[PDB]
Amino acid sequence: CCTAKEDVTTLPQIYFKNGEGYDILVPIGNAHNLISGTEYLWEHKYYNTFTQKLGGSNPQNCTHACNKMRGGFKQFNCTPPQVE
DNA sequence: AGCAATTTAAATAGGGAAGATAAGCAAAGGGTTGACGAAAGCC
Numbered sequence: 197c198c199t200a201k202e203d204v205t206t207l208p209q210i211y212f213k214n215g216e217g218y219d220i221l222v223p224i225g226n227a228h229n230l231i232s233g234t235e236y237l238w239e240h241k242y243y244n245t246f247t248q249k250l251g252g253s254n255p256q257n258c259t260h261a262c263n264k265m266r267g268g269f270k271q272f273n274c275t276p277p278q279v280e
Numbered sequence: 281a282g283c284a285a286t287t288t289a290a291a292t293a294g295g296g297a298a299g300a301t302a303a304g305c306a307a308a309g310g311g312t313t314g315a316c317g318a319a320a321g322c323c
Contacts, residue, residue, distance in 0.1 A: 254314045 231261055234270045246271040 247268040255262040
């Protein structure tokens with residue numbers, strides 16, 4: 197079941213240095229991080245955070261986690277302090 | 281048409297009252313934002 201698939205379409209593509217050259221790099225999301233972050237920051241009540249529902253109004257499209265956890269995946273609120 | 285002096289000390293204490301209450305309603309909308317995959321005309 198666990199194999200590979202490659203579609204850089206719609207996928208951010210950034211350069212990152214290899215030390216003496218560059219390496220064009222595609223950042224994709226982590227599945228363990230998303231579901232584990234939702235469960236843990238809900239069960240230890242972390243509230244300086246966001247909520248994002250992946251898929252839109254039909255969350256059966258993206259993944260199976262999307263389809264089940266339709267309440268919304270939780271993202272960290274990475275807002276810095278503001279002066280004055 | 282500028283000159284106006286210096287030190288010295290500024291009150292110790294005791295009191296700042298409790299008893300009551302601090303409304304009950306009813307409202308808080310849904311409308312878009314669906315991709316993959318499969319019939320089915322169409323170059």
